[PDB]
From Swiss-Prot:
The chain holds residues 29 to 152 of 152 of the full protein. Cu cation binds at residues 40, 78, 81, 84. Its cofactor is Cu cation. The keyword Metal-binding applies. Keywords: Copper, Electron transport, Metal-binding, Periplasm, Signal, Transport. The gene is bcp. GO terms for cellular component: periplasmic space. It comes from the Bacteria. GO terms for molecular function: copper ion binding; electron transfer activity. Binds 1 copper ion per subunit. This is Pseudoazurin. Residues 5-91 form the Plastocyanin-like domain. It is found in: Periplasm.
Length: 122
């Protein structure tokens, strides 16, 4: 299956956001990150992806597609916007949950990550 995540200045969930900011996918599914507004990108957060997964980074304004196969949670961020974060999860019972959950990001960013993990049923 293929999914889209849009990058927005303001969305359903607030300002500088990925929409949706949480997505549960099956191994082999893809996500394309699509700028709806100018000035955003996506990159994996250091330490916040599964073993077996590769880090990634897009260019500002780039439509950027990633295939997710390794099970677990994937923390993503937009480089210029400190609170603009999200989580993609592959499968159930992610093994690296604490890499995201126990992290020490700015409160607004961390709340967004934590709410994403909670919405994913963790
Ligand atoms: Cl593009
Ligand atoms: Cu952004």
């Amino acid at each position: 299956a293929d999914f889209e995540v849009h990058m927005l200045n303001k969305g359903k969930d607030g300002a500088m956001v990925f929409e949706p900011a949480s997505l549960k996918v099956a191994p082999g599914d893809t996500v394309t990150f699509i700028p709806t507004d100018k000035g955003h990108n996506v990159e994996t957060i250091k330490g916040m992806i599964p073993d077996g997964a590769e880090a990634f980074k897009s260019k500002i304004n780039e439509n950027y597609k990633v295939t997710f196969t390794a099970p677990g949670v994937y923390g993503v961020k937009c480089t210029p916007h400190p609170f603009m974060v999200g989580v993609v999860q592959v499968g159930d019972a992610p093994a690296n949950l604490e890499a995201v959950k126990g992290a020490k990001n700015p409160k607004k960013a961390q709340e967004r990550l934590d709410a994403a993990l909670a919405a994913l049923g963790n």
